[PDB]
Amino acid sequence: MVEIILSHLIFDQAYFSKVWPYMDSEYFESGPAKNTFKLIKSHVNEYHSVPSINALNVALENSSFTETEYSGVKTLISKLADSPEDHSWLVKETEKYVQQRAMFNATSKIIEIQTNAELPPEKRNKKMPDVGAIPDIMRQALSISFDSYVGHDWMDDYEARWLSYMNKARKVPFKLRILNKITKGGAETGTLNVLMAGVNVGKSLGLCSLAADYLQLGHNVLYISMEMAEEVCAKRIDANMLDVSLDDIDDGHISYAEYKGKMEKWREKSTLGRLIVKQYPTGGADANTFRSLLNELKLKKNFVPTIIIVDYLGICKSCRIRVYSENSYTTVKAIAEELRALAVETETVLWTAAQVGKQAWDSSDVNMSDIAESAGLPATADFMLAVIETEELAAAEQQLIKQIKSRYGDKNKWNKFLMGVQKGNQKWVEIE
Amino acid sequence: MVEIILSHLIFDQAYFSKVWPYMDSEYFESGPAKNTFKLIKSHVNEYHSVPSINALNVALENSSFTETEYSGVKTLISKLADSPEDHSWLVKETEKYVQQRAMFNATSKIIEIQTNAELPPEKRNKKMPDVGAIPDIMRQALSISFDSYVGHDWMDDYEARWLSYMNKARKVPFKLRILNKITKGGAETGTLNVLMAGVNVGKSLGLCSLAADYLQLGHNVLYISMEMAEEVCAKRIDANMLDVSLDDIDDGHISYAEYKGKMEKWREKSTLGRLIVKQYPTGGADANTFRSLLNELKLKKNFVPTIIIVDYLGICKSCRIRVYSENSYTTVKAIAEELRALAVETETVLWTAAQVGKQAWDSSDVNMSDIAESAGLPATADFMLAVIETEELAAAEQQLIKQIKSRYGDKNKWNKFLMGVQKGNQKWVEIE
Amino acid sequence: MVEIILSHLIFDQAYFSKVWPYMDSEYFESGPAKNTFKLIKSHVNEYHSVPSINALNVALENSSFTETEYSGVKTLISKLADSPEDHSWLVKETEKYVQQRAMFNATSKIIEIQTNAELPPEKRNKKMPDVGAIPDIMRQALSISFDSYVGHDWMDDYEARWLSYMNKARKVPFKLRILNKITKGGAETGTLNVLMAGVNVGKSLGLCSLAADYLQLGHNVLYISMEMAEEVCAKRIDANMLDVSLDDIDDGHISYAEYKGKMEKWREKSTLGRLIVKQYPTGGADANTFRSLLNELKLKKNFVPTIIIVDYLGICKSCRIRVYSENSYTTVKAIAEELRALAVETETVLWTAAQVGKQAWDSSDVNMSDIAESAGLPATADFMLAVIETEELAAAEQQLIKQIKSRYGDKNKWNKFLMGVQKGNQKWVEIE
Amino acid sequence: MVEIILSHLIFDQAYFSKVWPYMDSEYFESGPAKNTFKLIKSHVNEYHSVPSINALNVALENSSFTETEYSGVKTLISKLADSPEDHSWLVKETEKYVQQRAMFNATSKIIEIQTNAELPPEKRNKKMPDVGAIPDIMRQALSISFDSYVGHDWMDDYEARWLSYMNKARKVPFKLRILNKITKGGAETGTLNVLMAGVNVGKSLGLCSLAADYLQLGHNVLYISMEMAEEVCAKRIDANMLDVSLDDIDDGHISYAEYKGKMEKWREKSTLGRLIVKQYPTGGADANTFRSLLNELKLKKNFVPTIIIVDYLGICKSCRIRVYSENSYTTVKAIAEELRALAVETETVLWTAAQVGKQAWDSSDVNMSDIAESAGLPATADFMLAVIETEELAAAEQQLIKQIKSRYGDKNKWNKFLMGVQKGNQKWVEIE
DNA sequence: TTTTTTTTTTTT
Ligand SMILES: Nc1ncnc2c1ncn2[C@@H]1O[C@H](COP(=O)(O)OP(=O)(O)OP(O)(O)=S)[C@@H](O)[C@H]1O
Ligand SMILES: Nc1ncnc2c1ncn2[C@@H]1O[C@H](COP(=O)(O)OP(=O)(O)OP(O)(O)=S)[C@@H](O)[C@H]1O
Ligand SMILES: Nc1ncnc2c1ncn2[C@@H]1O[C@H](COP(=O)(O)OP(=O)(O)OP(O)(O)=S)[C@@H](O)[C@H]1O
Ligand SMILES: [Mg+2]
Ligand SMILES: [Mg+2]
Ligand SMILES: [Mg+2]
C-alpha cells in the first residue's frame, strides 16, 4: 500500500506526524515509489513541512531522473489522492507494511551474507558481516515499530520509575562480602562482568577464585579457558579448594591418598555444584561455539551453567566479524556484545578478564583510558574491575581494585579497596 | 514554476509584497509567460493593485498581440489557480528561479559581448558594452537575493536591536532572586554556563536544582547524564519537586498514593515544562551525539529544548580530540568549545559543572588561577559560578557561591553570596 | 560430497564414531541421498551396528520406493568404496557440509514463516511458528559444530588430573640451578620464552649460553641467526664449550692441536647433542620458512631439534602481514603468535630475544612496559626474563636478571638474581 | 611435464618431500595447471597433507572459477595417475623444469620492466621496479637448484670453521693504534660502523681522516657525500694527506710547486690506494644507487672499493619504503639494514655518520639513547663511536671518543679515550 | 579506533 502511504503523507497531517519519523527509503520498491519518497524526504529536510503536489512536480522537473524514472514518478504523483479513511487502521496497516519490508530486507541481506561467505578468500567482499551475524540482523528487523523511546520523560514515565524504586532485581551473591557490599547483593543474571588487569598480575587468579567461590555455593560453573590447558585451570581450582599450594602439587609434597581424601570430603558435601573446564585454541572459539558447548552439556551431561567464565575476551573469535577484517576496537566490542547476548539468552552470570594497556602496567592508578584492545568494552559491560598490584602490593601479598564501571551500585563509594591475593592457593582473602 | 509564480502574484498578498520589487520581465521567457507578466506589470503600473482574472482577460482583449500570442496568453491565464502553497517554500523557490534566470541572461550577455568584440572594429554595435564590463555584469547577476540578512548591521538594525533590549529577548530567568540579580535578568541563550565545585560539593545537586527551577518556569529541559542512570537523576528531580527527601524514597516512607497525588497535582498546573533525561556511558558522548539526540527528540518526541544540562564536563568526550583522558586539559578546552558551539547553534542555555583546583579545594576563596581547568574553562564560559562548602557552612546548611567569571555583568558587583543548600531534597533556597 | 560421507559411514568405524551423533535426513538431499541415509538410519536403529552393502541392498529390497527413487538408490548404493582419505580433512569437510546444509534449511524455514505470516489468519497454518521465532531458528543452525568433548569436571576426573600432575615430560631442565629453581623444573615444550635487554647488553650471549647448556645435556639445538654469520655464532659456541676465550681464538693463543683435542674430547662424550646454526637475511623468515627448514633438516639428517633459538623476533618477518603493511603492535604480535604456534606444533622450547626502548637503555631496572616492539609479545610469551647491566655490575662482571613474565612459577619469589656473565667466554655463570 | 609433477606430488610421498619446499605457483601455467596447483597448495596449507583425488574433486566443486576453468581442472585431475618411475629422473627433470620456468618468468619480467620504464612519467604504472634491478632479478633466476643449505653443524663442520680464524682476511686494520686495540685488529668486512657526534662537532672530519688512513694503507676508498660537494671532501683529504691547513689553501699560503711536489711524492709511493669521491643530492641515493655506482666503477674505472664510506645514512633514501610513508624509526632502520646488506654483499667495510638528538648537543656526555632518528640503528650496526667535544676539549684540540656499541670487543674496556683531532688539517692523532 | 616510535611544545 505504498500509494496510500504517500497519499496520506502528503494530504494528511496527523498521519504524517505519527508515521514520518519511522519511515525510511529502504521500505519502498526501487521503482517510482522510492524516488517519490526521496523527493518528499528532501523537501521535508529542506523546508520542514509536508510538500504539496505542485512542490513535488517542481522538484521532479528539477531532478536528475531518466525518462523511465521521470515518467513513473509523474504517473505516481498523478495517481495520488486523499481517500477518506480512519486514523486507526492507517497507522496499524503502515506499521505492518514497514515490518514486512524490514523482514524482507533482512532476509535478502542474510542471503547475500551466506552467498558472500562461501566465496574463496581474496575474492570475497570485505567489511560484510560473517554468517554468525545473521541472527542479530533478524533481531533488529523484528524490533521495528512506530513507538520509539528516546529518553526518560518526567511526568510521562513515572509509574515505571516508581516500580524501579520499589522493586529490586534478583542478585547471585558472591562469597566475598566486600563484593556484595560494592554490588548491593551480588551480580544479576544477564550481565557481562569484566576483571581487567595487566599481564601476569592475576587475571586468571581472580577468575579462578570467583569460580571456586561460586562452586562452593552450589552453582554450576563453566570455565572456558582460551589460553591455558584444562588441567592447569583445574589445578588452580584444586589449590583454591584443597588448601594446597601449587608448589606442593608440582613438587609432589601431597600424596594421592590425601588428595583423594580431600576430594571425597568435598564430594560428600551437599552444598557443592559442578565445575566443567573446557579449553579452546586461541582464536578458535566464539559465541556460537559456546552455545554448541552448552547444548552438548545439557544433552549429554544434564548440565546447565549459571556462572559461565571466559578466561580472556581478547583471544576469542568475533563471531560477527571475519578474522583480521576490522580493527581491535571494533572486534573486541563485537565480542563483548556477543558474549553479553549469550549471557542474557542463557540467564548466566558471565565473567571475563580483559587486558589493560602498556601504560597501565606498573601504574598505581588506572582509569577507563587504559584499556588496550577496546574502550567500548565498558559501554557493553555491566560491571568492570581492575587489578593494581604494581610494585609494593606484591611484597605485602595484596592487591587493589579500581571499580572502573559498576552498574550494580555507585563506583565512587568504595572505589579503591585492598584485596589479599594469595598466589600459592590462587585465592582472594579479605583484609578485614 | 512560472505558472505558480504568476498564479501567486495574482492570488496572494504577502507573496506579492515580498517578491514584486525583485521581479523583472526578462526573468520569465520570450513567449506566453513574458506577455502575461507584461500585462500584469502594465495593470499594476496603471492601477496600483493586483489585477483579477477578468481584468487580465479584458487587458488581453485590448492589447496588441498576434494569433499565436493571443492563444498562448489565453491558455496561460486560464491555467492559473488560487491554490494555497506554504509561503517559505514559495519565496525560496521563486528566488532560486529568479537567480537561475538572471545568471543565464548574464552569461548570454557576456558571450554576446565577446562575440561582438571579435568583429571588424569598423563593423560592430556601439550599444554593446565593452569587454571590460564583463566582470561587473556577472556581479549584478550574483547580487540578486529576495532578502539580504548577512549579520547585524549597525545603524541599519537599531530599531530591532532596541526591541531586543526592552523585551530581554535573550535572557532566561533563574527563579532565584540572587542569581537574577547578578545576571541582570538570568542567563542568555546560546551560552555555556558552568559550576565549579570545591572539595565536599556535589556537581549534580546544583544542576538538578537548576533543572527543577527551569521545569517549574515552563522550560523544556534536556538532562544528559554520564555517571548516573535516568532513574537516579529523575529521582533527584522528584526529591526537589515533590519535597520528598531522597532517602525517604529508598526507605519507603512515602507511599504510592502520596507520590501519585503530588505528580498529578504538578501535572494539573499549566506552568510546568517537560524534562527528558538521557543517559550515556562515561566518555561515550561527545558534542555530536547530543546533536543526534536533539534531532531524534525533535523528529520523534517533538521535544525541542530550551535548556540543556550536561551532568559533568570532564566525563564528556571531545569529538575533535577523539583520544580520551580521565583528567586532561586539552580535552576539557575542546569539550567546552564544542558544547558552547552546540548552545549557539541550538539557541539553548547550556549548563555543566567542573571540579575546582586542589588549592581551590583547601582555600574557601577560589581564584580563576586556582581552577583544575585553567585558560580552558575561563575562556569558553559565559558564566562560571563557584560553590564553596566549608565545615561552618555545612553545619548551617549553606554553601558560599562565588562569581569567578561573568560575561553577563560585572563580576565584582555581587561576588560572594550564601546559598541555602538542602542535600536531602537536592534544592537551593535563598537566604534572607 | 554426500557419496563420500555415506561411503565412510558404511566403511569406516572411526568416521562413524564422530559424525553419526550429529546427522539428520534433512542434511543430505530430497532424492536418492536422503533415501540412502534413511535406510542406513533404519538399519542402525533396528540393529545397533553399521550396515554392509549386501545388508543395505537387502533392506532396500524390503523397503518400498517408487521406480525413480528405487533406481536412484540402487545407483547411489553401487557407488560406495573404502577410499581411505585423511580423517582430519574428512571430519572438517563433513562439518562444513552439515553447517551449510543447516543454514540453507534454516533460511528456507524462515522464508516459509514469513510467507505464512502474510497470509490471512483463516488461511495460515498454525503449525508454522510466528515471526518471533526467526532469530533463534537461525541461531540453532549456527551451533551444529562437531564436538562431543565437554571438558574436565574436577570431581569426575580428579584421578586423571592427578595422573597428569605426574606427567613431567613437558619440562626441560636448564643446566643452571637458579633457572630451574625459578621455573619449577625448567622450561616447557611448546612455549615462547624471551630474553630481553638493551642494545649491546648480551642477548645473543645469553642465547648462545642457553644453546651450549642444552647441547651439553644431550638436546638437539637449532640456532637461527638473523644478524650474525654462521661462523661468528659458532665461534661464540666454541668459546663457551672449549672455554678459552673470544680474543684468544682471534689472537692465535690456541694452536690447531689443542682445538682438535678439545673438539675430539667433546665428540667422545655421549651426553652431547647436535647443534645446527642457520642464518637468514634481516626481515626474510618466519615459521613458514622455519617449517620448511625443519622438514629439510629432518630429511637430510637425523635431526629433530628439541630447542629452537631465534636470534631476534623483531628481525623476523610475519607470515600474513607484509613487510610494512601495519604498525609494530600488530606484525610483532603476529610473529610472536606464529612462533608460539610453531613451538607448540613441534613441541619444542622456543627461545628468542627482544629489544628494549631507549627509555631503559641506561636504567638500573627494566619493566615489562619497556618493550621496544609490540606489547603483544609480553602476552604470547611464557618466561620473559630481562637482562640489566650497570657500571657497578660490569665492574663485577655480574649482569642482573629480573623475572619479568613468569608463567611457570611465582614471578616474585626470586625477582632479581645476579648472574656471573663472562663476556670473553660468552657464558653465564651461576653465583653461590 | 606438469601432469607428471602434479601426479607425483599426489601419489608419491618421497617425491613430495624434496620438490614441495621449492614448488611455487608461478612455475606451471596460466590455466588448468596453475588452478590445480593452487587447489593442492590450499589443501596442504589447510591440512598439512597431500590431497587425494576425492579431496581435489571436492575442492574443485567448492571453487568459484568459470566453466572453462572448471572443465580444464576436471580433465587435468582425471588425467592424474601414478606411473612406475624412479626418484632420480623425476627430481632432475623437475629441477630442469623449475629452472626453465624461473628463467622464463625472469626474462618476461625484464621485458616488462624495460617496456614500462620507456614510458612518460606519472603514467609509468608505479610499484614496478626500475631498470637498475634488472640483473639482480636474473641472479634470483639462477639461484634455484633444489639444494637449499640446511645450515652449519658445530661438530660435523669444524675444520672449515677453524680455517677461518687465522685467515684474518675479514678484518681490515686501522692506522691509529687505539682503534685497532679496541677493535682487536680493526674493522671487519660486511659491517656497518657509525660515528655519532652531533652538529658541527666532527663526524665528517672523522670520516675523512678514516678515508685518508685507509688510503695510505693501500686501500681503494669510495667516499659518498650526500650533503657536500666532491671538491670540499677532496679538499679535506688534501689537507689531511699533504699536512697543509684548510686555511692555508683558502688564504693561498701554498704554491703550485709545493702542491705538485707533494702529490707526485704521494703518487710514487707504492703503499697508496685510490680514493674516489661521489656526490649525490640529499635524499636521492639508496642501496640500489650504490650498487649501480659500484657496477659502473668496476666497469668504467676498474675500481673495486673495500672501504666504502657514506657521509650520512639519515640523508639517504630507503630503496623499499616510499618516501615519507613510515616514521623516522622504521625508515632509518630500513636504510641501515639495506646499507649493511650492501656491505655484506660487496664485502666492504662500510662507515657512516649519525646525528644525535637535540638534548645531547653541548653536553659533556652522549649516551646511546641520544641517537636521533631511530633506536633501530644501534641494533643494526656492528660498531658505533660517539664523538664528544666540550669547551675545555676544544681548547685542548682534543675530542673524547666513547665506545657506544662495540661488537668487535668489550666496550667497558677503554670506553672513553681522548683523540687529538686537529680541525685545521682534518686529522685524528693519538695521544699515546 | 589503538599502537608505536621521534620530536616539539606546553602545562603544571
Ligand atoms: N605455578 C605457579 N606457582 C605459583 N605462582 C604462579 C604459578 N603460575 C603463575 N603464578 C603467579 O600467578 C600470577 C598471575 O598469573 P595469571 O593467572 O596467568 O595471570 P594472567 O593475567 O592470566 O597472565 P597472562 O594470561 O599470561 S596475561 C603470576 O604473576 C605469578 O606470580
Ligand atoms: N673549512 C674549514 N676550515 C676550518 N675548520 C673547518 C672547516 N670546515 C669545518 N671546520 C671545522 O670542523 C668542525 C666539524 O666539521 P664537520 O665535519 O663538517 O662537522 P659535521 O658534523 O660533519 O657537520 P654536519 O652537521 O654533520 S653536516 C667544525 O665545527 C669546524 O670547527
Ligand atoms: N668479540 C668480542 N670479544 C669480547 N667481547 C665481545 C665480543 N663481541 C661482543 N662482546 C661483548 O658482548 C656484549 C654483548 O654481546 P651481544 O650478543 O652483541 O649483545 P646483543 O647486541 O644484545 O646481541 P646481538 O645484537 O644479537 S649480536 C658486548 O657488550 C661486549 O662486551
Ligand atoms: Mg591467564
Ligand atoms: Mg644488539
Ligand atoms: Mg657533516
Residue numbers in the entry:
A (entry chain F), B (entry chain A), C (entry chain E), D (entry chain D): 1 to 432
Article excerpt on this structure:
The T4 bacteriophage gp41 helicase and gp61 primase assemble into a primosome to couple DNA unwinding with RNA primer synthesis for DNA replication. The domain architecture of the gp41 helicase resembles the bacterial DnaB helicase13,14 with an NTD and a RecA-like CTD that are connected by a linking helix (LH). The gp61 primase is composed of an N-terminal ZBD and a C-terminal RPD that are linked by an 18-residue flexible loop. Here we report a series of cryo-EM structures of T4 primosome assembly intermediates.
In contrast, the other map (map 2-II at 3.4 Å resolution) showed the gp41 helicase bound to the ssDNA template that had undergone major conformational changes to become a planar ring closing the gap between subunits A and F and likely represents the active helicase configuration. In contrast, the third state of primosome assembly is represented by map 2-II at 3.4 Å resolution and map 3-II at 2.7 Å resolution. First, the N-tier rotated in plane by 60° with respect to the C-tier leading to a domain-swapped packing in the closed state, i.e. - each CTD now aligned with the neighboring NTD. Second, the linking helix (LH) from the N-tier relocated to interact with the CTD of the neighboring subunit. Finally, the N-terminal helical hairpins (enclosed in a yellow, dashed-line shape) closed in a scissor-like motion that increased their crossing angle from 100° in the open spiral form to 165° and almost antiparallel in the closed-ring form. In the active gp41 helicase, five ATPγS molecules were resolved in the C-tier with the nucleotide-binding pocket between the CTDs of subunits A and F unoccupied. In the open spiral gp41 helicase, the ssDNA binds to five (subunits B-F) of the six helicase subunits and coils inside the right-handed C-tier spiral, as compared to the activated helicase ring in which the sixth subunit (subunit A) now joins the other five subunits to coordinate the ssDNA phosphate backbone. Therefore, the 10 nt of the ssDNA stabilized in the inactive open spiral is increased to a total of 12 nt stabilized in the active closed ring gp41 helicase. Importantly, the scissor-like movement that activates the gp41 helicase exposes a hydrophobic patch on the side of the gp41 helical hairpins, which recruits the gp61 primase.
